[PDB]
Design a protein around this ligand. Structure first.
Ligand SMILES: Nc1nc2c(ncn2[C@@H]2O[C@H](COP(=O)(O)OP(=O)(O)OP(=O)(O)O)[C@@H](O)[C@H]2O)c(=O)[nH]1
Ligand SMILES: [Mg+2]
Lengths: 1013, 171
């Protein structure tokens, strides 16, 4: 190279190292910007430096850079590749530092390639160097064969495995495994034969005391098992016995023993049937993991250090941690069938040893094996408790903790069967560890294990143990350490569901202990939650004894410098459910934060191409592509918006008129704008459910109401045509219904009625279309029925006119879900004698429907016939009286769950006809009707029948019973007059005749009957 | 001043939190936006221990191949390393063996700590079960969170004990 070029490049490569960002950034620009025009010179330089520079940093960097830039070699002129190769190779064979020869070898490897010219000088250099008296030459040659295994395509590797230099051996093994890593399986059996030479070389490492080098070889062997487990079949016993021997030699440093364990473990993951076909594996594996799990609290028999620390793992207990996860891993792979026997053979022994570490080890080993061995151990369950539970009182606290751990683990792993059969042994055992006699760590771990057990235990099983659980946990609550206070509060809140009643008992000592913890965001929050759950449990009057203090701590907590914030909100809310309208004065503290959050805007922004690839690292954001562009919403922020709205809505629901102050602001700035949140349906839905509730809040307090309703209805209606999600469309109709119900009579205007019709039609249209393609649809149509009906009523029929324009659509539906829809619509039409225009278009199909095999169709049909007689008496008589016989037949599996509903509407339908055309009927009928009582399921039907029964007033015992049944079955209500009519009939009978009718009825319904008559 | 100092190379896939992790140590602030590192940024971190001030010169490298390019040249004369991955992104863990492989290409034998960052996030994709590369290579593993400071110092403390060779070293 030109001498100028050299000093410029040399400066740059040297500067490339400053820890200092300037010197090094300047060199970075220089390389990237100044150095297709210069690349060959640069590669030729860096190859020269690595080969010939006397400076170590320079030589190393250059070799590393050369390799890196080469992968960024094929597009280089052949005259220069050859010169590069020749200098790299001259460098390699010259006098270089070990690490530089390593880096030269790495660079040389980048110069061997399928498309690159043959380089037979390399091949020759490797073979010679492998025979050199310099280990580094030998080691470095294997390294090359590792990186470029194709150069390989037997005595070389056998000399390699046997070499006096450990470095060479490790590189031999590395190269040997690399071959299988890189080449196809068809090539494998060609080096496979060497595996026994390799394995036979292994005992030499322990003789020389070179266990660090053994660990490296174990690393390579681990990789080989994951590629070709079967290759090991013939010598499986030999590797097992060797790893056994290594692990037991506990004067060796951990790495040879932990990697030996991993070698053992990895056979279970890659050849389970191989492991299972050889009883030696299972026995060795259990034995060695057991030995390593005793290596705890070394040189500390009392466990002083462990007793004094927090409830996290000691990361100094390396072999123990490794052994735990290994046993777990093997158990999960091999199952209990195979492992229970070897496992238990050892546990039986160690449970009884005089060394505490072995009694602990036994617990932790069971703990590790339990899930994987569940298939067998879920049945050997008394046997397990017979070993474990005796140790719960070991003189040694870590053995105690160990036993708690197992009871916890198996309460999970053998659930729900263990909860059913061992509650009588497990709970007392764990509960006895709660006492302050025991050490903090043990109390805490036992308390944790009670959570595992409770997770799958019924309230009945827990009940007799609760007072005992609670009295003990209160003491834990008084510990000076937080990891016990916290775990105590986790358990009390887990149990709060059951003990909803047993707090009143413990309340007076508990609540101040709770207030003291509050006076660890996680701690404080869990404490808040226990506090307010206890307050709900013991009710408002008893809660008043500390409510003011609790409130004032909460207020200070909210105004102090996000897990906690979700606890404050839930707690504020539970206080509101306790306090009733006594929460009102807290609103200006509690609501405004909720308002801020609930007013978040949808924030859509243009992301840039390429920036979209990385946005994947903001998980609160989501990105969608629209045209050639990407846009993003802050989704998390909008989830929080829904959260806030869910809270404001439950405030408005609880506080009724008292929330009115907030209505207009919440309506206009939160509810309504939310309907336009196009990227987020949670928002839109929350916005809609809010509407009617707000109105009814303002109503209860007091034109404003009218303005807000007009705005809100129209936005709802507008949403109907554009809304993509039918689930959301259903919400909007629901919301309209509920709004109409709040606002009352004639609350919609004519444009609204028209805009509604369009909406309905676009929804009906798309429902039809989704279904001419194949509950979601049934439900939507269910709500559309409700909104049509709700709208009809507020107009008092006038909506009849609009209703027509979409009559063809209705009519298509009429001729099962679409049918039920249409029939229900028609029933609503008639309810508000101006439908004659349509009588002819539907009665043929309704009369058909009457006898339909579908109960739901008959129901809707008969309802229509009944409603015809009630609201349109005369424009329908030619129909009602003929069909009357059909109804007497539909009436007769009639009284059966599936069609009890249908036959009850027919029943009411005939009672309607009988009423409208009273003595203009061809009277057997009314006696037929009667035999259809009682009406116990459909409430609006029952409501007509008992009104008709009451207009009319042998069958007296049936007259009475008809009413008893309806009342007791709660189908007519609010037990609110047919009774007056009945008592008059019973008046006209003696003392004794009156009595006798109730003689059939049991005590509980006779209590109710006394309070009815 | 500190006379005990080490070159620490910090590698891992882009967006796993490497810079956020270092900034948190350096200034205590948590940076919310992702601004890819270009090449490398070298930051000194000084820990005050019961054996004196220990300085780690942290070479915060670029995880995005497009900004890396020559990353591998930063590995030179490093005395220890952290490989980071993202517990919420399975792909970052799947790349751990490649990061490891490259580091040992240059830095033959040297303590390496593997860190799974972002354990403060709800939906873990890389569960404790999955994470086992540390067993196959004898690396020390830790769950960490730059956001919550969970196990914040563990990686540096481990490396410090290992490199000083004193297990009683305390921060
Ligand atoms: N929730 C959470 N977010 C984190 C955590 N650590 C980092 N982040 C965020 O993740 C993003 C990526 O952080 P960076 O630290 O710049 O990523 P980097 O690994 O340095 O990436 P490169 O420089 O491209 O290699 C930023 O938005 C951080 O705020 C964490 O522990 N928890
Ligand atoms: Mg970075």
């Amino acid at each position: 190279l030109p001498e100028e070029v050299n000093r410029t490049l040399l400066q740059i490569v040297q500067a490339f190292a400053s820890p200092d960002n300037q010197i090094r950034s300047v060199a970075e620009k220089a390389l990237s910007e100044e150095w297709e025009n210069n690349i060959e010179y640069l590669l030729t330089f860096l190859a020269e430096q690595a080969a010939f520079s006397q400076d170590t940093t320079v030589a190393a960097l250059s070799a590393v850079l050369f390799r890196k830039l080469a992968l960024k070699i094929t597009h280089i002129r052949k005259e220069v590749l050859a010169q590069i190769r020749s200098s790299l190779l001259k460098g390699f064979l010259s006098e270089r530092a070990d690490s530089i020869r390593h880096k030269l070898s790495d660079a040389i490897a980048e110069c061997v390639q399928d498309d690159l010219p043959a380089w037979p000088e390399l091949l020759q250099a490797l073979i010679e160097s492998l025979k050199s008296g310099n280990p580094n030459f030998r080691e470095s040659s294997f390294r090359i064969l590792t990186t470029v295994p194709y150069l390989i395509t037997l005595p070389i590797f056998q000399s390699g495995f046997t070499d006096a230099s450990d470095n060479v051996k490790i590189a031999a093994v590395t190269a040997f495994v690399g071959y299988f890593k890189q080449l196809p399986k068809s090539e494998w059996s060609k080096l496979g034969i060497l595996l026994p030479s390799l394995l036979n070389s292994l005992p030499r490492f322990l003789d020389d005391g070179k266990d660090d080098a053994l660990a490296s070889v174990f690393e390579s062997l681990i990789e080989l098992v994951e590629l070709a487990p079967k290759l090991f079949k013939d010598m499986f016993d030999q590797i097992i016995q060797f790893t056994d021997m290594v692990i037991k030699n506990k004067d060796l440093e951990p790495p040879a023993r932990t990697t030996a364990l991993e070698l053992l473990t990895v056979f279970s993951e890659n050849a389970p049937q191989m492991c299972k076909s050889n009883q030696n594996y299972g026995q060795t594996l259990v034995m060695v993991t057991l030995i390593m799990m005793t290596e705890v609290s070394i040189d500390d028999d009392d466990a002083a250090e462990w007793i004094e620390s927090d409830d996290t793992d000691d990361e100094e207990e390396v072999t123990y941690d490794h052994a735990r996860q290994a046993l777990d891993r093997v158990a999960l792979k091999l199952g209990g069938e195979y492992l229970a026997a070897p496992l238990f053979q050892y546990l039986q022994q160690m449970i009884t040893s005089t060394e505490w570490r072995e009694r602990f080890a036994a617990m932790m080993a069971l703990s590790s094996a339990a899930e994987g061995c569940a298939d067998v151990l879920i049945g050997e369950i008394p046997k397990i408790l017979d070993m474990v539970i005796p140790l719960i009182n070991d003189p040694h606290p870590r053995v105690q903790y160990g036993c708690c751990n197992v009871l916890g683990q198996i309460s999970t792993d053998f659930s729900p069967f263990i909860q059913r059969t061992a509650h009588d042994r497990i709970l007392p055992a764990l509960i006895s560890k709660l006492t302050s006699e025991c050490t903090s760590r043990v109390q805490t771990h036992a308390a944790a294990a009670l959570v595992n057990f409770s997770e799958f235990a019924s309230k009945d099983i827990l009940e007799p143990y609760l007072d005992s659980l609670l009295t003990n946990l209160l003491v834990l609550l008084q510990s000076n350490k937080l990891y016990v206070q916290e775990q105590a509060l986790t358990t009390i809140a887990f149990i709060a569901e059951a003990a909803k009643n047993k707090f009143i008992k413990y309340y007076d000592t508990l609540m101040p202990l709770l207030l003291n913890v509050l006076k660890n965001s996680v701690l404080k929050g869990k404490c808040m939650e226990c506090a307010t759950l206890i307050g709900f449990a013991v009710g408002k009057e008893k809660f008043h004894e500390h409510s003011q203090e609790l409130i004032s701590i909460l207020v200070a907590l909210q105004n102090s410098d996000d897990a906690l914030r979700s606890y404050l909100e839930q707690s504020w809310s539970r206080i509101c459910r306790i306090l009733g309208d006594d929460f009102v004065p807290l609103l200006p503290i509690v609501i405004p934060p909720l308002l801020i959050t609930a007013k978040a805007t949808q924030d859509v922004g243009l992301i840039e191409e390429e920036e979209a690839a990385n946005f994947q690292q903001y998980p609160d954001w989501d990105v969608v592509q629209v045209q050639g562009k990407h846009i993003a919403i802050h989704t998390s922020v909008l989830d929080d918006k829904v959260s806030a709205m869910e809270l404001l809505q439950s405030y408005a629901t609880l506080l009724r008129g008292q929330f009115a102050v907030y209505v207009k602001e919440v309506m206009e700035e939160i509810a309504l704008p939310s309907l336009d949140f196009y990227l987020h349906d949670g928002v839109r839905a929350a916005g809609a459910t809010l509407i009617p509730i707000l109105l009814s809040c303002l109503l209860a307090a007091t034109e404003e109401l009218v303005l807000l309703w007009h705005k809100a209805s129209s936005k709802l209606i507008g949403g109907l045509m554009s809304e993509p999600m039918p689930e959301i469309t259903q919400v909007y109709h629901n919301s309209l219904v509920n709004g109409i119900k709040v606002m009352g009579d004639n609350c919609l205007s004519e444009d609204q009625l028209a805009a509604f019709t369009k909406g309905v039609s676009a929804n009906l249209t798309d429902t039809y279309e989704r279904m001419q393609d194949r509950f979601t649809d049934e439900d939507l149509l269910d709500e559309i029925n409700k909104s049509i009906a709700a709208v009809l009523k507020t107009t008092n029929g006038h909506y009849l006119k609009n209703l027509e324009n979409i009559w063809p659509m209705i009519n298509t539906f009429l001729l099962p879900i679409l049918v039920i829809f249409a029939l229900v619509v028609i029933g609503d039409l008639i309810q508000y004698e101006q439908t004659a225009s349509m009588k002819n278009a539907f009665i043929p199909k309704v009369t058909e429907c009457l006898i339909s095999p579908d109960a739901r169709i008959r129901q809707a049909a008969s309802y229509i016939i009944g409603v015809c007689a009630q609201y349109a008496p005369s424009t329908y008589a030619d129909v009602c009286i003929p069909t009357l016989d059909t109804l007497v037949q539909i009436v007769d599996g009639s009284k059966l769950e599936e069609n009890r509903s249908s036959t009850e509407n027919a029943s009411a339908a005939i009672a309607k006809i009988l009423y409208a055309y009273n003595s203009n009927i061809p009277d057997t009928y009314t006696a037929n009707w009667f035999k259809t009582l009682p009406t116990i399921t459909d409430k609006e039907a029952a409501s007509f029948n008992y009104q008709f029964l009451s207009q009319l007033i042998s069958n007296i015992s049936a007259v009475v019973d008809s009413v008893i049944q309806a009342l007791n079955e709660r189908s007519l209500t609010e037990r609110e007059t047919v009774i007056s009519s009945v008592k008059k009939l019973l008046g006209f009978l003696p003392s004794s005749d009156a009595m006798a009718i109730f003689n059939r009825y049991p005590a509980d319904i006779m209590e109710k009957v006394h309070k009815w008559f | 001043e500190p006379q005990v100092q080490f070159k620490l190379v910090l590698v891992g896939d882009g967006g796993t939190g490497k810079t956020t992790f270092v900034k948190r140590h350096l200034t205590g602030e948590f940076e919310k936006k992702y601004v890819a590192t270009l090449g490398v940024e070298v930051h000194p971190l000084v820990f005050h221990t019961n054996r004196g001030p220990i300085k780690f010169n942290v070479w915060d490298t670029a995880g995005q191949e497009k900004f890396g390019g020559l990353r591998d040249g930063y590995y030179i004369q490093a005395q220890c390393a952290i490989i980071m991955f993202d517990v919420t992104s399975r792909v970052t863990y799947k790349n751990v063996p490649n990061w490891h492989r490259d580091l040992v290409r240059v830095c033959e034998n040297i303590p390496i700590v593997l860190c799974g960052n972002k354990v403060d996030i709800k939906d873990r994709k890389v569960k404790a079960k999955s994470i086992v590369f540390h067993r196959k290579k004898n690396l020390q593993y830790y769950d960490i969170s730059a956001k919550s400071n969970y196990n914040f110092e563990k990686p540096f403390l481990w490396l410090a004990r290992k490199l000083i060779g004193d297990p009683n070293l305390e921060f």
